[PDB]
């Protein structure tokens, strides 16, 4: 949906894909990254964030 | 004590008694 302001409106089918049997309890989660670029594509990026 | 699907490495206090127990080549059992 082309609106890029926030989270959307709509009714979305959702279906499972994969299960993997680990076998222990979890109580914490996150995600992490790295954002190192230079050539990229847009003119002179030089992004000091 | 503990519920299934569960593991534990270094048996912390539950002090205690002599810990280990063996199913040896002494099967007479």
Coordinates of N, CA and C in Angstrom, one line a residue:
Chain A
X1 N 0.9 -1.2 0.0 CA 0.0 0.0 0.0 C 0.9 1.2 0.0
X2 N 0.7 2.1 -0.9 CA 1.6 3.2 -1.2 C 1.8 4.2 -0.1
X3 N 0.9 4.3 0.8 CA 1.1 5.2 1.9 C 2.3 4.8 2.8
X4 N 3.2 5.7 3.0 CA 4.4 5.5 3.7 C 4.5 6.3 5.0
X5 N 3.4 6.5 5.7 CA 3.4 7.4 6.9 C 3.7 6.5 8.1
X6 N 3.0 5.4 8.2 CA 3.1 4.6 9.4 C 2.7 3.2 9.1
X7 N 2.3 2.4 10.1 CA 1.7 1.1 10.0 C 0.4 1.2 9.2
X8 N 0.0 0.1 8.6 CA -1.1 0.1 7.6 C -2.5 -0.1 8.1
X9 N -3.4 -0.2 7.1 CA -4.8 -0.8 7.4 C -5.0 -1.8 6.3
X10 N -5.7 -2.9 6.7 CA -5.9 -4.1 5.8 C -6.0 -5.4 6.6
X11 N -6.3 -6.5 5.9 CA -6.6 -7.8 6.5 C -5.8 -8.8 5.8
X12 N -4.7 -9.3 6.4 CA -3.7 -10.0 5.7 C -3.6 -11.4 6.1
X13 N -3.8 -12.3 5.1 CA -3.6 -13.7 5.3 C -2.2 -14.0 5.7
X14 N -2.1 -14.9 6.7 CA -0.8 -15.2 7.3 C -0.7 -16.7 7.5
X15 N 0.3 -17.4 7.0 CA 0.4 -18.8 7.0 C 1.8 -19.3 7.4
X16 N 1.9 -20.4 8.1 CA 3.2 -20.8 8.6 C 4.1 -21.4 7.5
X17 N 5.4 -21.4 7.8 CA 6.3 -21.9 6.9 C 7.2 -23.0 7.4
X18 N 7.8 -22.8 8.6 CA 8.9 -23.6 9.1 C 8.8 -23.8 10.6
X19 N 9.2 -24.9 11.1 CA 9.3 -25.2 12.5 C 10.7 -25.9 12.7
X20 N 11.3 -25.6 13.8 CA 12.6 -26.3 14.1 C 12.7 -26.6 15.6
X21 N 12.8 -27.9 15.9 CA 12.7 -28.3 17.3 C 13.9 -28.1 18.2
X22 N 14.1 -26.9 18.8 CA 15.3 -26.6 19.5 C 15.3 -27.4 20.9
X23 N 14.3 -27.2 21.7 CA 14.2 -27.8 23.0 C 14.8 -27.1 24.2
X24 N 14.7 -25.8 24.2 CA 15.0 -25.1 25.5 C 14.3 -23.7 25.5
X25 N 14.2 -23.2 26.7 CA 13.4 -22.0 27.0 C 14.1 -20.7 26.6
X26 N 13.4 -19.7 26.1 CA 14.0 -18.4 25.7 C 13.2 -17.3 26.4
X27 N 13.9 -16.3 26.9 CA 13.2 -15.1 27.5 C 13.9 -13.8 27.0
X28 N 14.4 -13.7 25.8 CA 15.1 -12.5 25.4 C 15.3 -12.7 23.9
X29 N 15.3 -11.5 23.2 CA 15.4 -11.5 21.8 C 15.7 -10.1 21.3
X30 N 16.3 -9.9 20.1 CA 16.7 -8.6 19.6 C 17.1 -8.8 18.1
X31 N 17.7 -7.8 17.5 CA 18.4 -7.9 16.3 C 19.4 -6.8 16.2
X32 N 20.4 -7.0 15.3 CA 21.7 -6.2 15.3 C 22.2 -6.2 13.9
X33 N 23.1 -5.2 13.6 CA 23.4 -4.9 12.2 C 24.7 -4.3 12.1
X34 N 25.0 -3.9 10.8 CA 26.2 -3.1 10.5 C 25.9 -2.4 9.2
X35 N 26.3 -1.1 9.0 CA 25.9 -0.2 7.9 C 27.1 0.5 7.3
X36 N 28.0 -0.3 6.9 CA 29.3 0.3 6.2 C 29.2 0.2 4.7
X37 N 29.2 1.4 4.1 CA 29.1 1.5 2.6 C 30.0 2.5 2.1
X38 N 30.2 2.7 0.7 CA 31.0 3.7 0.1 C 30.7 3.9 -1.3
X39 N 30.9 2.9 -2.2 CA 30.6 3.0 -3.6 C 29.0 3.2 -3.8
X40 N 28.3 2.2 -3.3 CA 26.8 2.2 -3.4 C 26.4 2.5 -4.8
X41 N 25.5 3.4 -5.0 CA 25.0 3.8 -6.4 C 24.7 5.3 -6.4
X42 N 24.1 5.9 -5.4 CA 23.8 7.4 -5.4 C 25.0 8.3 -5.3
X43 N 25.1 9.2 -6.3 CA 26.2 10.1 -6.4 C 27.3 9.9 -5.3
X44 N 27.6 11.0 -4.6 CA 28.6 10.9 -3.5 C 27.9 10.7 -2.1
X45 N 27.8 9.4 -1.7 CA 27.1 9.1 -0.4 C 27.7 9.8 0.8
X46 N 28.9 9.4 1.2 CA 29.6 10.0 2.3 C 28.7 10.3 3.5
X47 N 27.9 9.3 3.9 CA 26.8 9.4 4.8 C 27.3 9.4 6.2
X48 N 27.5 10.6 6.8 CA 27.7 10.7 8.3 C 26.3 10.8 8.9
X49 N 25.8 9.6 9.4 CA 24.4 9.3 9.5 C 23.5 10.5 9.9
Chain B
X1 N 11.3 -30.1 40.7 CA 12.7 -29.6 40.5 C 12.9 -28.9 39.2
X2 N 12.9 -29.7 38.1 CA 13.0 -29.1 36.8 C 12.0 -29.7 35.9
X3 N 11.6 -29.0 34.9 CA 10.5 -29.4 33.9 C 11.2 -29.9 32.7
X4 N 10.4 -30.6 31.8 CA 11.1 -31.3 30.7 C 11.7 -30.4 29.7
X5 N 12.3 -31.0 28.6 CA 12.9 -30.2 27.5 C 14.0 -29.4 28.0
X6 N 14.6 -29.7 29.2 CA 15.5 -28.8 29.9 C 16.9 -29.5 30.2
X7 N 17.9 -28.7 30.2 CA 19.3 -29.1 30.4 C 19.8 -28.2 31.5
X8 N 21.0 -28.6 32.1 CA 21.7 -27.9 33.1 C 23.2 -28.4 33.1
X9 N 24.2 -27.6 33.3 CA 25.5 -28.0 33.2 C 26.2 -28.2 34.6
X10 N 26.4 -27.1 35.3 CA 27.1 -27.1 36.6 C 26.1 -27.1 37.7
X11 N 25.9 -28.3 38.3 CA 24.8 -28.5 39.2 C 25.0 -27.6 40.4
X12 N 24.3 -26.4 40.4 CA 24.4 -25.5 41.5 C 23.6 -26.1 42.7
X13 N 23.7 -25.4 43.9 CA 23.1 -26.0 45.1 C 21.6 -26.2 44.9
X14 N 21.1 -27.3 45.5 CA 19.7 -27.7 45.4 C 19.1 -27.9 46.8
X15 N 25.1 -28.2 52.9 CA 24.5 -27.9 51.6 C 23.8 -29.2 51.0
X16 N 24.5 -29.9 50.1 CA 24.0 -31.0 49.4 C 24.7 -32.3 49.9
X17 N 24.5 -33.4 49.2 CA 25.2 -34.7 49.4 C 26.1 -35.0 48.3
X18 N 26.7 -36.2 48.4 CA 27.7 -36.7 47.4 C 27.0 -36.9 46.1
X19 N 27.4 -36.2 45.0 CA 26.6 -35.9 43.9 C 26.3 -37.1 43.0
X20 N 27.4 -37.8 42.5 CA 27.3 -38.6 41.3 C 26.6 -39.9 41.6
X21 N 26.3 -40.7 40.5 CA 25.7 -42.0 40.7 C 26.0 -42.8 39.4
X22 N 26.4 -44.0 39.5 CA 26.9 -44.8 38.4 C 26.1 -46.1 38.2
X23 N 26.0 -46.4 36.9 CA 25.3 -47.6 36.4 C 26.4 -48.5 35.8
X24 N 27.2 -49.1 36.7 CA 28.5 -49.6 36.4 C 28.4 -51.0 35.8
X25 N 29.6 -51.6 35.6 CA 29.8 -53.0 35.3 C 29.6 -53.8 36.5
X26 N 28.6 -53.5 37.3 CA 28.3 -54.3 38.5 C 26.8 -54.6 38.4
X27 N 26.3 -55.1 37.3 CA 24.9 -55.2 37.0 C 24.1 -56.1 37.9
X28 N 24.8 -56.7 38.9 CA 24.2 -57.5 40.0 C 25.0 -57.4 41.2
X29 N 21.0 -56.3 38.6 CA 20.5 -55.2 39.4 C 19.5 -54.4 38.6

